[PDB]
């Protein structure tokens, strides 16, 4: 479970060209999740 700053995941928008990054990264959603 990779952590990046205040996130418990690695945003895919900063992986650039690292293939190992794209295998574990997650995308910031288009909408703020509810409860």
């Amino acid at each position, epitope marked *: 479970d990779f*952590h*990046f*700053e*205040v*996130f*418990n995941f690695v*945003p895919c*928008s*900063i992986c650039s060209n690292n293939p190992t990054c794209w295998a574990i990264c997650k995308r*910031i*959603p*288009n*909408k*703020k*999740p*509810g*409860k």
Partner: antibody, heavy 122, light 109 residues
Framework: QVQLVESGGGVVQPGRSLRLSCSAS????????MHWVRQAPGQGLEWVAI????????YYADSVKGRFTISRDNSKETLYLQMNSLRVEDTAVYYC???????????????WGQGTTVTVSS | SYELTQPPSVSVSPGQTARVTCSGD??????TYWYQQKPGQAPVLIIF???ERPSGIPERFSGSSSGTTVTLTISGVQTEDEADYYC???????????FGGGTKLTVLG
């Protein structure tokens, strides 16, 4: 250190325009949503606008809809607020704040700047 | 349109327990957040996602929820806790952010 510095405030007449800037440093600016929040003298906080990390989603308060435009430049880690058709009731201190949207250890408007003062008067 | 209801003022003595409530029609589906603002300073995050306290915030601050009403609780209040406290959430569509009217917490020190 994580830091947000607002600038561009000043005194303007009603109907004029003003452009605020918010320069970030110390964190990956390009993965956070960014807010504008204002506070009139002696009054409470009022949400103004938000922009998504990639600049897509932009939402505004009804009190500023059609007059204010929010934008960001991730290459310079700067947030902007274009304020047109300014009114007397727009007089406030204007803060910028980051928002992870899906934060884990911190969430919401977890980092605020010190604000910049905008005064609209004839 | 969508508004959060927050008491304008609460008074407390040091050592007592201060409580600040905040209600909203969509709070059962939308997370709520709490900010502290001292005179002349920027707001500071105290509680996020109803109940979570960030590291660096004293343990005496806590938050809870009963549905459409959330509560900020400060046990053993200190004189340094005197400030304005704002609740904040989103509307039912999750595309508009709203602040409560703010609660001035007076600590009789």
């Amino acid at each position: 250190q994580v830091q947000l510095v607002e600038s561009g405030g000043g005194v303007v007449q009603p109907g004029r325009s003003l452009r605020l800037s918010c320069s970030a440093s110390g964190f990956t600016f390009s993965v956070y949503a960014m807010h504008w929040v204002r506070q009139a003298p002696g009054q409470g906080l009022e949400w103004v606008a938000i922009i998504w990390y990639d600049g897509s989603n932009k939402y505004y308060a009804d009190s500023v809809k059609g007059r204010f435009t929010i934008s960001r430049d991730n290459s310079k880690e700067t947030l902007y607020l274009q304020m047109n058709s300014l009114r007397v009731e727009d007089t406030a201190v204007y803060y910028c704040a980051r928002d992870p949207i899906v934060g884990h250890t911190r969430d919401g408007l977890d980092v605020w700047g010190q604000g910049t003062t905008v005064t609209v008067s004839s | 349109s969508y508004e959060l209801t927050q008491p304008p003022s609460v008074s407390v003595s040091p050592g007592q327990t201060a409580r600040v409530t905040c209600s909203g029609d969509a709070m059962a589906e939308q997370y709520t957040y709490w900010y502290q603002q001292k005179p002349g300073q920027a707001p500071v995050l105290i509680i996020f996602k109803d109940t979570e306290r960030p590291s660096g915030i004293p343990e005496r601050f806590s938050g809870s929820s009963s549905g459409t009403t959330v509560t900020l609780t400060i046990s053993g209040v200190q004189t340094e806790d005197e400030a304005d406290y704002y609740c904040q959430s989103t509307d039912s569509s999750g595309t508009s952010w709203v602040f409560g009217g703010g609660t001035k917490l007076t600590v009789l020190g």
